[PDB]
Write a protein that binds this ligand. Sequence first.
Ligand SMILES: Cc1ccncc1NC(=O)[C@H]1[C@@H]2CCCC[C@@H]21
Ligand SMILES: Cc1ccncc1NC(=O)[C@H]1[C@@H]2CCCC[C@@H]21
Lengths: 304, 304
Amino acid sequence: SGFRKMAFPSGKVEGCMVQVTCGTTTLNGLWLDDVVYCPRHVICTSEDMLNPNYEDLLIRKSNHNFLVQAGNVQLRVIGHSMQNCVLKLKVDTANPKTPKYKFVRIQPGQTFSVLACYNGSPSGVYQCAMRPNFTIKGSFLNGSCGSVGFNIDYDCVSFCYMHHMELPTGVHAGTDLEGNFYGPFVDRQTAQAAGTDTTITVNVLAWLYAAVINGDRWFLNRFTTTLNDFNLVAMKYNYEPLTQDHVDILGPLSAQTGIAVLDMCASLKELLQNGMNGRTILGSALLEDEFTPFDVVRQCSGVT
Amino acid sequence: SGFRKMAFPSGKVEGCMVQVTCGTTTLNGLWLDDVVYCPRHVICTSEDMLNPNYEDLLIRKSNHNFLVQAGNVQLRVIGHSMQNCVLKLKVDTANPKTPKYKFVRIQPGQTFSVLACYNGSPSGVYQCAMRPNFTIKGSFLNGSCGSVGFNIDYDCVSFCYMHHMELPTGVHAGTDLEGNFYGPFVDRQTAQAAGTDTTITVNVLAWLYAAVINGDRWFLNRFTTTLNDFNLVAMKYNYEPLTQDHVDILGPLSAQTGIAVLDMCASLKELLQNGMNGRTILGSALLEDEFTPFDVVRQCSGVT
Ligand SMILES: Cc1ccncc1NC(=O)[C@H]1[C@@H]2CCCC[C@@H]21
Ligand SMILES: Cc1ccncc1NC(=O)[C@H]1[C@@H]2CCCC[C@@H]21
């Protein structure tokens, strides 16, 4: 028992982190097989960053200008190419620590672990959600670009995020491993609107199920609701509308606890309308939306 | 910017996890050099656990009864001994992945990362505090015993905790790596009083400094207080009394922000007396005490 905001074990990802330097800029790279992936803005200088012409900036660079260091061993760069907002530096040595991996583009509302790095060295790991507006609320300082987000399924690491930017609001933006930004963002130092965000309803419900499983059950009530009625409340409180696909994914938790999904929705409706009244759920004084239903099932069953 | 409950990268610890089976019980072991450390209760059966006679139960066991498996390779046990509540199984092979390490006994109020494991396989990593009453509020299911807590200082892993028990209240208890319990706990299936707990004042103050550094500053006020006055409020609200040693450890954060420690204490006093008024600090609707002043400095400076 107990329920914590748990990150995946980061070892397989730690073995892939490298430092990439181009000119005056240093950031992190991900070394998988004989390729090192990193944000393309490693090629920018201070004067470039308002609106860099990446194609022109890259044309001034040769393989020998990309300094790649894996711990303390230097990698030989034998090719370079830009794909969307990432650079792919071909190296002459395959990473001996390359885990089984995939590149995946996650959906908004899904969760993943971030291994924050500086100078190719891991600093820490934390779990977060991709917001419905495609931003993440992480912990990133200058030099953390190139740090990656991932999930692990047995021995396979699915890389889903590479960090590129901190918006002027302090929230974070980045790309999948093919260099496509999540959201409307571009890799320039400009104020950029992040869409209206919402709370991830299916995750809050999954977390209320994790709370009942672990003994926090004060919020259960004698009520029920419908998807229609619940969605009027979700609308008022800026929660994602709940669909039958969300109800379906909550099936295992509903089956385990015996609490029908719409009955849990009625508990969530009452919490939205009345607040916590100075109480906590799983050590939180707010409704937590950074656990998916899969995360709850995995944590509650001790999956490795 | 951004501030997250970050765990240390777990790779160095993942390389030390093994599975230990004795009879019908399987749990985790920590393989460092040629020794595997695990909870002594791996030698118990269901009928033993109310009050096991560990010395007698261990006398029935030989080296060949301790099955130690590191991933998929079997380790040969050439010695066994019980030290307090841990078993030390001498193996014929030194762990090639043994990091630089220390065994440390942490103080209540200090934080550490836990690598939750089942069957010698890592499941996840999370950061937590050792409560002032020597319990931890973790995420542990049956089979997680032997999972360890640790801190990392550059290349050195300081192991501080090994998981042994879930109290009937759902909170967790364990030992240092010499097998001495933190707190009054014994490794028996009995109801055991955990002392009155308190909130870790110096950590809440450190976290308010992390909040100001990251832009959440609505809680700053025009007031100041004294240690005496603050401690009367700390008393009322079950917070640890603040000492000059705590004020001293907050020095770097006070110097960086320019907010005197007693002025931050006056903000904390007002938050204790008035609550958050439906607002949040660093995404939390309660006063967070799981970040030490060292954690805040490390996270805010990007230490690797
Ligand atoms: C400095 C920093 C801090 C944290 N996370 C990320 C960053 N980096 C950025 O925001 C870079 C974005 C793309 C290229 C142009 C310059 C700025
Ligand atoms: C079952 C479990 C679940 C989570 N964390 C820990 C445990 N294990 C225990 O509580 C064991 C304590 C010491 C020896 C006697 C039996 C019980």
